[PDB]
Structure 1
Amino acid sequence: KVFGRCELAAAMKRHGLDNYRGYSLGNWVCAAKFESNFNTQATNRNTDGSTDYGILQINSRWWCNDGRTPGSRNLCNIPCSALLSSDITASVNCAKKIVSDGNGMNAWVAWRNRCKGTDVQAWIRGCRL
Structure 2
Amino acid sequence: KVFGRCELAAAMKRHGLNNYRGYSLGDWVCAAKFESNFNTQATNRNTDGSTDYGILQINSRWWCNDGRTPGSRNLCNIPCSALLSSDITASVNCAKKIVSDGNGMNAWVAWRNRCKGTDVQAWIRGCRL
The verdict on a shared fold, with TM-score over 0.5 as the criterion, is: yes
Aligned: 1:109 with 2:118: no
Q: Which residue of structure 1 aligns with residue 5 of structure 2?
A: 5
Deviations, residues 55-96 of structure 1 (Å, cap 9, x unaligned) = 000000000000000011100000000000000000000000
Q: Which residue of structure 1 aligns with residue 128 of structure 2?
A: 128
Structure 1 residues without counterparts, runs of 5 or longer: none
- Kindly report the root-mean-square deviation, in angstroms, between the aligned alpha carbons of the 2 structures: 0.3
Identity among equivalent pairs (%) = 98
* SS state at 1:52 partner: strand
Deviations, residues 10-66 of structure 1 (Å, cap 9, x unaligned) = 000000100000000000000000000000000000000000000000000000000
Following TM superposition, where does structure 1 have runs of at least 4 consecutive aligned residues deviating by more than 6 angstroms?
Answer: none
What's the offset of the Cα at 1:110? Answer: 0.5
Q: Which residue of structure 2 aligns with residue 43 of structure 1?
A: 43
Aligned residues: 129
Structure 2 residues without counterparts, runs of 5 or longer: none
What's the offset of the Cα at 1:109? Answer: 0.5
Distance (Å, rounded) in 2 between the aligned partners of 1:47 and 1:35: 17
Alignment of 1:1-129 (within 5 A): 1-129=1-129
Tell me the TM-score normalised to structure 2 length: 0.99
